[PDB]
Structure formats: C-alpha cells, structure tokens
C-alpha cells in the first residue's frame, strides 16, 4: 500500500500512500523534468495510486521544449545538424534543404547564403533561392 517514486511522461512523481479516500492524496501531480514543460494547451500530468500499490497510467504529460528532445525519461539537446523549434512530442529534425549545420540545441537551421525562409513559414521549411 505505497506507490513508489516514478519518472513517467517526462514528469517526476513522488512516493504516495495507497488507499486514500481523498482524490487530493491518492492522485498526485508530477513535476516536469529539466527542459520539459506543459504545453500552453495541455494537461498537467497527474497519476493515480491504486490500493494495491501500483500506479495507474498518468493523465497529461510534459513535453521537451524547443531545442530538446525526449531520450528515455529525459530532455536532451538536439545534436548539431538538427533542430526543434517548439515544445512537442517530436524528435529533433535534421536540418532542411539549403540550410547550414546548426549548433547543439538549436531551434532552427540558418539558411545557406543566397537563400531565404519567408517569415510566414516554420523553421522546418527548407530555404529558397533569393531572387
């Protein structure tokens, strides 16, 4: 009748007592691991501890922020040559066509000289020849 410390959905959950009559006690809020956040329109992670001592599947999750990707239960900076411009479930993406190699932890790859990205387009957009 005790649920253990857990990492789940890029959130840390504390040790909790099992068999509590109060939903404030048996269900606990997880705290995001480093460089993970709850998206603007997302549910904050919460997990229920059952009477038998086993965690249920959590509701909600944290997501790795821009420039980071989930590796196991951690958020790790994108490798050079990769990028990630938003907090999302997605891995880092390889730089698109006509960009220059990015540093570690980048949110975009810079256009090759003579190429451009329109401001309306996302960072995943490949760069196009300047007319």
């Amino acid at each position: 009748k005790k649920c253990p410390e857990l990492l789940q959905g890029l959130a840390h959950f504390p040790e909790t007592i099992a068999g509590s009559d109060a939903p404030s006690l048996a269900t606990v809020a997880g705290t995001c691991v480093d460089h993970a956040v709850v998206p603007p329109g997302g549910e904050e992670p919460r997990m229920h501890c059952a009477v038998d001592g086993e965690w249920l599947v959590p509701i909600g999750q944290c997501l790795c922020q821009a420039g980071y990707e989930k590796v196991e239960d951690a958020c790790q900076a994108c490798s050079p040559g990769f990028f990630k411009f938003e907090a999302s479930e997605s891995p880092c993406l390889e730089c698109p066509e006509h960009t220059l190699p990015s540093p570690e932890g980048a949110t975009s790859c810079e256009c090759e000289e003579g190429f451009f990205r329109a401001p309306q387009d996302p960072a995943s957009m490949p760069c196009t020849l300047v007319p």
Partner: antibody
Amino acid sequence: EVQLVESGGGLVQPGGSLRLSCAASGFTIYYSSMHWVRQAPGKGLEWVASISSYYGYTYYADSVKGRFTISADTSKNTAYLQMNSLRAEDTAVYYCARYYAMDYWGQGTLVTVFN
Amino acid sequence: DIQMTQSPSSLSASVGDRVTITCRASQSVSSAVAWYQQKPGKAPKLLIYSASSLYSGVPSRFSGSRSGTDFTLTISSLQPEDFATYYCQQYYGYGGYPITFGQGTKVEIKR
C-alpha cells in the same frame, strides 16, 4: 537499438530490374532522411539516392537518374530502391543509411549485373 | 558536385602514433562534413559529424577540425583496432547538392 535490415539484392541481367528494401526498427523512419550508398568491389563509397518523407523530397546521383527510384512506406517503416535498366557499372554492395551524417547503416546487399 | 580531395591515399603507422588525414573541399562546404571508418567485410562507421562533433561511443582519441575548406581527422594515439580505411564526406545544403565522398585513406601497420 536502431537496426536497418536490407534485402532484395542478387543477380540481374543488363536491362533487368531489382528492388532493394531497407527495413528499419528502433526509430520512426518518417522523421529521418534515408540514403542509398553503394560500393563497387575494391572501390570507395558513392552516394546513390536520398529521401525524406518528412520534407517530401527525393534526390538522385546523376549516374542513376531516370533509372532508379527511391521511395518508402512509412506504415511499414521501410525504405526502397527500385533499380531498372541495370548496367554492368551498377554492380556493387548497396547500403541504406540514416541521415546525411550517416549514423546507422544496413548490412549491405550485393547487386551483381551478369551477362 | 563539390569534390572532397582526400590525402594521403594511404599511410603506414605504429600503435601509439599520432595520425592525421586531411580532406580539401573544392569550395566552401560550411561545417557539413563527416568522417567514417570502414573495415573489410563491414559497413562504414560514423566517427565525426559537423566537422568536429564526436559521435556517441567513438573514443576521444578521434577528433575533427576545420580550417576554411580544409578538414582533418586526427587520431591522437593509433590503436590496433584503428587500422582501417577512412573516408571524408560532404553534405553541404542537406540535399540541395550531390553528396560526395573522399576517395579514402588506408591506414596500414608499419613494419
């Protein structure tokens, strides 16, 4: 662990066709770029073709344009190289590999054009 | 195609030696350069990417550097497992342009 398993190589007459497969596990192929690189016996490495289903492009070495077609089925997590109008110069071990800086490689499959 | 001119085509060395392999790009390729090792009967193995980033699991005796269009792979202390062929590669533009490889450098045992 990431793994790329190739198949489909073998013996083909000139003008014939083969289809190579590159089955990926341990990652989602849609989020990667995949590449075919070939090595003729006793020679170096030569890029053949690239694909990104994420960006929606295919690119080809001049030497194979108009003859080979690179494709993928993301629902099978597999990449393909359709090789038509084969030539003696195409004989090589064909590798599939992940990303422009190719971090994982298939085990290779030998393509032998024979008369 | 941007050419990668790799030198030397071969070299003989002893275990413990410092070894340098150099590749000159025919025009600027930014830092879009990788280095690979290959042994007979095996697929190539990525050592260095983005000109100087060490790939995970590759020992720190391997390093890469860039000066303009010149790229060098240095092995600070050659190990028995390092006798192999080495290739540079450029991927400038990440698809904008043909990917090309150096012609390779065979690192052999001196005796």
